[PDB]
């Protein structure tokens, strides 16, 4: 009845409707907040975070892009020297800044700019006032979320050592819900504990061969790597996300740091009961409806096991644009076995296994929700389950009521 | 290098996509990395359209970079094909795409397909949207219209109607109901609505209609040297240049100018006393060449507003702003930059500023009140309602537009003063 | 005596005024104090006219009162009469002529006119504007209306549109356009547009449109009873509406309903993607009984709102209004104080209100969005530009004013939530 | 050739395009602060109240309607009562204010409710912190501005005795403008002085046989009465519009209080040649145009006699709701003596000789503003003129400008 661990899952490229890691710069500018980034690119990315941060491009926000020109484009020894000018030039004018990110686009890594090096020497140039640091966001390697996954794996290498034994929390999440998180750690008795990213440069966590770390977000892989390479060690944990998610995922912290068995319940069973009862109130709508998601962050594994555990839905086809076997273990052995799984994308063929199914809710792109909604589809755009609060146990019942929502709506204009 | 926030047009390729998306059985396939599919959104989200832009990208990664660039883009082009089986076809580079080897040409004619496929020319950084959309119509154009023999109705066509157009559905909706008032009938209206046979039929129409310069200019050229047909060169927005616009019409058609000015309720509204506290505001006004010397005519002839300041993002409209400037006194500001704006702006500090998207955000920040009057624009300016910029009910829409954010006679003269 | 600092509605007389200005060639005598002309400026000033109305005062004062008050009145008509030459003419009473002992009815016959003298029965002091609106129209056709022949072709008449009211003239012109469509052409539209030989001539029509029961109820039930004439008991506010209404027509007359929905938008902008965050949004709904019983059926079935309060001004449509809350689960607010509409949105909380001028203050005063649906209302709802409620042109521009007010996707997630 | 005091001015009655009374609380309550002015009238009253205030109707004003029901006009029903229950409910929630004005209306003076006997009783009910007067604002006895005139005249009587020589400027006067003659009167070395009515309740100023007062304002016939009564002077003056009408004014009160000519040179020169600087800037527009005015306010007069000798426009007819004779006297002397002057209307006679006369420029009411535009003729809506600081030198440039507008924006719009 329940579990996912040996399921083949379908590998597939092709046409496919995705976010390139840029993206990831719409909202981590807004979490990191003495850091700035800067695209490498041309007037094309300019337009991609123009149009994605939407009104928040008035807000005289914490990025750019350094569009590049005819004069620009060939001639290697020349592209990196007129750069330093155009930092220095930004950095001059905004000293609130100490951490400058050097993103990588496309055009940028096709005119194979050595962005890592470029980064190496502005940091010498502009210390100890700014560090600068290097990652990629261009199409040709990421999708939409493995914007963040980079761009803290290139903070990685650089951070502090320590002896200490710490709990590192990874993942940029909602300032809400990390206090939420900090709160019932500290409850438990476990500390003390860090986020990755920290909201300040100042601020940041230290690693050493005795941390612990944890993943808040499944998309985490190549950061990963980064803290595993300086010695910390991975907690393993189905990501919270509802009542059982968040339960799950704080065991293991208890199960890692040694908490006692009633000392668990005693801080658990209270938020808990909250959780599952703002989760029924849309049981009504979900329950035996059906459930199909084309790959957008990689969030789509884990919380199509919450919508089928919690909520009750059935589950189709959960499309993921990355699958890391690994860090998805916890989660995907707790999915209903019945589930077809996808790694990447073809466009065209999963719009007609989509069609083939015909399921209840879809989730999905924004470029591709409203031609499905004229076709008969109830749909929910996945781009929401980034920018609202959903990880751990207050957000449960909002979690729920994102899905919710449209289904309630298409009942509701007949 | 060139540090960006803003920008008031996106890269040539999403222009291209303006003409593809506005035409229907037309299939363009851009060549592209995964990621550049974001320009679809503008089109279900902004536009808010019932189905898929007709867009599709060879989408190259990491993984297939290399020799398999070239293979990647021979299938997009079969695929689209194949499964859409489209009437014409065009294909062009995207930014990225541009510092590759691969020939757009050379590949689509290996294929041979049944159906013309029309490469375009998009210099990604030196060129911006507007001449992205201009030019992959001009292609299309010069594809495939001829030579033709007359309609025996007196008839044209709608030239610079695009997707993801300020207004463009209703503008092109009461322009038509400007020459039906007139006796005279739409042969094709595109590219908006036309399908690539439509615009085979082109050259049967007796003139044609500039609606919008900065994306038909070279298209309506084109059909001046291949098929003799003039082509309107006063667009008609504000009661007077509409006026100006059908006394030009009858001149190309030696027709009688007959008129139906039986709901143009703007003069009155702004002769009417209630408007006598306009005479002397102060207006700024920005945006592309054409809605910005279309408004600036508005404002001091038909409102009794005072410009002090006019600009535009677009360069290639940059000498008829400069003249059309120059008779109310002031230099044409031609910039890209919006800090320039804001700065020229804060100078010469209006009372009403007439702009763009990000204009109505420096106005909200400097607390000036404000109005929309040219693209780019946010998707409340794609509305559900009838909401034309030209003719007689655009000249209506214009006045409440503009009047609405102010102030009126009494207060001033206030729920502030009397607070 | 209360305490009044707003009203909803003027005195009856003001009403009578709506319904004379309404006409062409017809003549309203009040006998009133100098000084109840500053309602001529209603007229002149919110709906902009370019002509002083049909209405002039006997202009009583200090130094001529008692036996001199009723000459003032035969003069007033004497004057009136022998000057514009109308085709017929009312008489009627102020508030303070209320108090006299002069006789109207007596005066006018004394006087023996070369045409009818319409005399109207406004009580001041307890009625208020609408009555004396639906009364005076009421009074007239009693008095010209006479049974004809059908005509040949299947025409309808448009009953109740008046001056001043709101967007009675885009309405008008819209109701007329989807019954076109269907194939009935319209007999006489009154009061709006005619002279009482319009009304001479409404018997000739197979049905009427009720179009707004505030100033039409009573002048349909009479040609119910006299001409036989059912009348439509549906007001085409929304999509839904609109299509019972037509149906009710269809049922009224035999013809098959045929829709022209292709500018029809409003139900597919609801259907997008972008409007899901409209889902469940608390609303409160206030004005005439009319447009609060449509708008909140727009707002619960068309757009996914949840109506949180409803209510209205007019005692006249206590019944009509009570029978429809209840199918939201709510008790009607039946009520003229603007203070205890403040109570109830207090109470309520609500995320969006739609309501009249005075609640667009209590919205600002409170901080909550707002969007006007409902006379007494400033000039700007006054418009240029075609915006009407009804119909198919309705329903969309209902859709963009109501969301207009509010946050959009993004922000409501996410300017000083960054700034 | 100039004056009019020969002229035969026509008198004349029959339908009437003007404002009562009532209106003058939509301008007066703005100035005395703590003041509130309730209207015993019917809807119609609050209705005009609520029309002419527009937008400071939302903003919690200092003035409401008492408004009479069904069971008010009955012969049983009290008036003493009635009144008093909503007057104490009223000042129960407003404790700020100190002033109240039982402004009567036609409906009250009809059923002719003692609204003077009902001021002394609420009085006594509510001294010391709270007091009571009555007026008129009725369309019976008043036309637009004069209900400024019938409430200052109210207070009157009940100002504080004097014996000194105190100056009393009379006329609501918008704040910036009476500082400004504050300060012209300073410099010039009269004072002190005070204002009425005064910016609050306990700082009016008090009158006796030695207080002289002038007259910034043309329709303060009343208040003259009640203020002669009480044995202070007045000061003949022309009205301070314009440059020319205001060193008139101020010279009147020069010569009262005996100031050397040239302490006035001093103080006037320097403002003086700055105010007329400023008016030749609507010269062009304005000179050799014909006016014509309707009857308003009472401030056609002084304005056509600032239009005609400053700004070179032409008189035809200039109409006036009231002539007051010996206030007049002074600006009558001033005016073109080909003028017709009209003290009434006659409505439609009147709009016969307007078209007749075909004049450049109209002042009228909004009433009768847009139906004369669409006739063809400039029109200037004099209601502003009340609304806009217009005496005095500073606002003497605003003042020309106020009339060369409409004439501005008609050129400008069909060039
Ligand atoms: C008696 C009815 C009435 C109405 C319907 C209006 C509407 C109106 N009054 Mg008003 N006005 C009325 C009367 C009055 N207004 C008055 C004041 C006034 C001013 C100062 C002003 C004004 C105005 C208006 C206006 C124009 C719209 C607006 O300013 O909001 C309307 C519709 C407005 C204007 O532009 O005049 C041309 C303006 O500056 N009114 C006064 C002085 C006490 C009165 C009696
Ligand atoms: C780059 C393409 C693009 C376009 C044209 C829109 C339009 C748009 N995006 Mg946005 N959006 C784009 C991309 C993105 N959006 C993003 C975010 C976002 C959110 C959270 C939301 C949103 C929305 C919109 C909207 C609706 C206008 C609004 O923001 O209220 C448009 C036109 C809005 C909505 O209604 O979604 C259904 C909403 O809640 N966008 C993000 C996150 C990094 C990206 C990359
Ligand atoms: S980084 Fe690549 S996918 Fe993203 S906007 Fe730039 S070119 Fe497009
Ligand atoms: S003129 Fe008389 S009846 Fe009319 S509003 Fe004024 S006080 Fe009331």
Not at chain 1, 62 to 70: H, M, Q, S, Y
């Amino acid at each position: 009845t329940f579990g996912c661990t040996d399921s083949p899952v379908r590998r597939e490229r092709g046409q496919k409707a995705v976010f390139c890691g840029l993206t990831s710069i719409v909202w981590l500018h807004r979490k990191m907040q003495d850091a700035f980034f800067l695209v490498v690119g041309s007037r094309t990315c300019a337009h991609l975070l123009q149009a994605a941060a939407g009104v928040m491009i008035f807000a005289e926000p914490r990025f750019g892009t350094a569009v590049l020109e005819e004069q620009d484009l060939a001639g290697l020894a020349d592209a990196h020297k007129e750069l330093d000018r155009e930092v220095a030039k930004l950095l001059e004018r905004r000293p609130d800044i100490r951490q400058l990110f050097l993103v990588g686009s496309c055009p940028s890594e096709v005119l194979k700019l050595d962005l890592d090096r470029a980064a190496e020497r502005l940091s010498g140039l502009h210390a100890p006032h700014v560090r600068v640091y290097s990652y990629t966001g261009s199409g040709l390697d990421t999708t939409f979320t493995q914007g963040e996954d980079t761009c803290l794996a290139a903070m990685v290498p650089t951070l502090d050592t320590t002896e200490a034994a710490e709990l590192i929390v990874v993942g940029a999440l909602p300032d809400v819900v990390e206090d939420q998180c900090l709160s019932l750690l500290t409850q438990l008795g476990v500390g003390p504990v860090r986020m990755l990213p920290a909201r300040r440069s100042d601020i940041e966590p230290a690693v050493g061969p005795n941390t612990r770390f944890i993943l808040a977000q499944p998309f985490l892989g190549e950061t990963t790597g980064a803290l595993e390479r300086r010695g910390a060690k991975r907690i393993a944990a189905p990501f919270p996300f509802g009542e059982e998610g968040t339960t799950l995922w704080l065991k293991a912290v208890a199960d890692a740091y040694g908490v006692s068995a009633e000392k668990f319940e005693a801080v658990t069973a209270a938020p808990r009961a909250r959780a599952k009862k703002a989760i029924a109130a849309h049981l009504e709508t979900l329950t035996g409806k059906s459930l199909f998601m084309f790959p957008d962050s990689q969030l789509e594994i884990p919380l199509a096991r919450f919508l089928a555990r919690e909520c009750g839905m059935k589950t189709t086809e959960i499309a993921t644009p990355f699958l890391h076997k690994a860090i998805m273990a916890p989660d995907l052995a707790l999915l209903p076995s019945n589930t077809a799984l996808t790694e990447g994308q073809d466009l065209e063929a999963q719009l007609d296994r989509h069609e083939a199914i015909n399921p209840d809710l879809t989730v999905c792109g924004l470029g591709l929700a409203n031609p499905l909604e004229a076709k008969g589809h109830a749909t929910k755009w996945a781009i929401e389950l980034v920018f609202t609060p959903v990880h751990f146990y207050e957000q449960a019942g909002d979690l729920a009521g994102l899905f919710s929502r449209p289904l309630r709506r298409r009942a509701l204009l007949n | 290098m060139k540090l960006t926030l803003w920008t008031y047009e996106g890269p040539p390729h999403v222009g291209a996509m303006r003409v593809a998306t506005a035409m229907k059985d037309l299939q363009l396939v851009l060549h592209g990395p995964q990621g550049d599919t974001y320009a679809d959104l503008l089109f279900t989200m902004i536009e808010r359209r019932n189905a898929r832009p007709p867009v599709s990208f060879s989408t190259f990664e990491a993984s297939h970079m290399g020799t398999d660039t070239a293979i990647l883009l021979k299938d997009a082009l079969a695929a689209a094909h194949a499964r859409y089986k489209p009437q014409a076809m065009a294909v062009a580079l995207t930014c990225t795409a541009e510092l590759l080897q691969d020939d757009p040409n050379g590949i689509s004619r290996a294929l041979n397909l049944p159906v013309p496929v029309v490469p375009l020319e998009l210099p990604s950084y030196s060129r911006k949207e507007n001449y992205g959309a201009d030019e992959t119509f001009r292609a299309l154009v010069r594809a495939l219209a001829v030579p033709m023999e007359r309609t025996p109705e007196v008839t044209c066509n709608l030239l610079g109607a695009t997707a993801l157009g300020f207004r463009h559905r209703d503008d092109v909706a009461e322009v038509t109901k400007l020459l039906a008032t007139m006796g005279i009938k739409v042969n094709v209206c595109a590219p908006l609505g036309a399908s690539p046979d439509d615009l085979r039929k082109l050259g049967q129409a007796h003139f044609n209609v500039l609606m919008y310069p900065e994306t038909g200019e070279s298209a309506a050229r084109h059909l001046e040297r291949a098929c003799k047909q003039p082509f309107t060169k006063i667009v008609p927005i504000g009661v007077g240049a509409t006026r100006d616009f059908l006394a030009e019409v009858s001149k190309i058609t030696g027709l009688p100018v007959v008129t139906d000015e039986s709901t143009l309720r703007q003069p009155w509204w702004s002769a009417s006393v209630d408007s006598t506290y306009l005479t002397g505001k102060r207006v700024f006004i920005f945006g592309d060449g054409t809605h910005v010397i279309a408004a600036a005519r508005i404002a001091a002839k038909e409102v009794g507003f005072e410009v002090v300041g006019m600009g535009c993002y677009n360069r290639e409209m940059a000498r008829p702003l400069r003249t059309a400037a120059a008779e109310y006194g002031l230099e044409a500001l031609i910039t890209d930059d919006y800090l320039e704006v804001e700065k020229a702006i804060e100078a010469a500090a209006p009372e009403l500023i007439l702009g763009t998207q990000m204009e109505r955000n420096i106005a909200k920040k400097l607390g000036l009140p404000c109005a929309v009057i040219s693209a780019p624009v946010h998707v409340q300016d794609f509305p559900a309602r009838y909401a034309p910029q030209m003719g007689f009910e655009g000249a209506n829409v214009l006045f409440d537009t503009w009047v609405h954010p102010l102030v009126m006679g009494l207060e001033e003269h206030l729920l502030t003063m009397f607070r």
